[PDB]
Homo-oligomer: A and B are copies of this chain.
Amino acid sequence: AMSLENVAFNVVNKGHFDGQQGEVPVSIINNTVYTKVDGVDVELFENKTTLPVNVAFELWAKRNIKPVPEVKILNNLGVDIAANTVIWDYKRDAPAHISTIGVCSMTDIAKKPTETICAPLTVFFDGRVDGQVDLFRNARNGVLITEGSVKGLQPSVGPKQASLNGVTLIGEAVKTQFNYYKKVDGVVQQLPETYFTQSRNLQEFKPRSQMEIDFLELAMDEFIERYKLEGYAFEHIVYGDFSHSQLGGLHLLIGLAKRFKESPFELEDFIPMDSTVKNYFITDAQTGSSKCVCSVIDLLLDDFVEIIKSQDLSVVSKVVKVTIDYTEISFMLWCKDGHVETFYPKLQ
């Protein structure tokens, strides 16, 4: 007995949809949902999606409020739809997926992931919900997350961090590190060995190793001497070159964080969505050095050092493929006389 007024009642009284009975007066004007409180209209939701306002309001109310995989992981694993939940994309302020299963009558393609319409779609299953591990076993295509072992299913240990109501975090009171499983055409797929992006912010950047503490504290030349990085072009790739009109390198988030402490800069997120590699139009405020497309990845500095130190430096230019967040990331490696000139996540 789903309704707009019942969804709004749950939002007002429970902070989100919680299956409670009740109705509150609602008014819809343009792309905003309001409710009357003390005689005046109070905004409950502003539709930033391409779905109708009342439909997006119901999907947002029915969002998953447990720690869930970050949308970039779900996209890299080919997830098309979620089973009986909504994975809300807080970077886009929209549902991560077009359709639903057992959530909302307007967006539902099926009520259960067992319907034949779900067979060709990669359905997201959550082992924390009763019967979802078994639904994954019977699904033709799907991705499963669990907190423990599944009998006979070989696990892939995912990232330490998960998204809880839009906050990316490594859980202390809740579990955020899941076992990951994937099935393509009825066959459980071996997830590849992968690095993970650290999902940090530029404003609240914190080092997660002794090498990252030394990058942020030590000067460029003493850091490169301490970690034996001579000939690996860290001056260009990680630190960044701000001497010319075109900004050189600056592809690691830690390098942007070190620069951010000294001088500010504009990072234009021209495709605003969660992704393993992010592209920004950067403008350095101190120098005026800029780059239209500056690919940035948040790898742990130790992981980036391991990647670049494991490459053959005897070829002028080559594509280096590295698995990060379960996806193959192509990097462009440019060398000269046995030393690195540049290394960057290749712009497609």
Q: Are B54 and A28 in contact (CB under 8 A)?
A: yes
Given known A15-B270, A28-B53, A106-B26, contact A92–B288 (CB-CB < 8 A):
no
List which A300-323 residues lie within 8 A (CB) of chain B.
none
The range of chain A's interface size is 35 or more
Copies in the complex: 5
Question: In the assembled complex, which residues on chain B have CB atoms less than 8 Å from the CB atom of A167?
Answer: 265-266, 283, 285, 288
Q: Which of A1-9, A216-224, A337-345 contacts B (4 or more CB under 8 A)?
A: A1-9
A103 contacts B by Cβ under 8 Å: no
Comparing A148-156, A170-178, A252-260, the segment that makes contact with chain B is: A170-178
User: Does A328 make an interface contact (CB < 8 A)?
Assistant: no
The residue from B95, B96, B270, B287 contacting A172, defined by CB atoms under 8 A apart: B287
Chain A, residues 83-94, CB within 8 Å of chain B (1/0): the string is 000000100101
Q: A171 near B347 (CB under 8 angstroms)?
A: no
CA distance A38 to B106 in the complex (A): 12
Most buried by B among A37, A49, A120, A288: A288
Q: How far is the CB of A59 from chain B (nearest CB, A)?
A: 12
Contact present for B292 and A18 (CB under 8 Å) = yes
The answer to the question of A210 belonging to the interface, with a C-beta cut-off of 8 Å to chain B, is: no
17 contacts between A and B (CB under 8 A): A12-B270, A12-B271, A15-B268, A23-B105, A28-B28, A34-B50, A36-B105, A38-B273, A40-B98, A41-B94, A44-B271, A67-B288, A167-B265, A171-B287, A172-B287, A172-B289, A173-B287
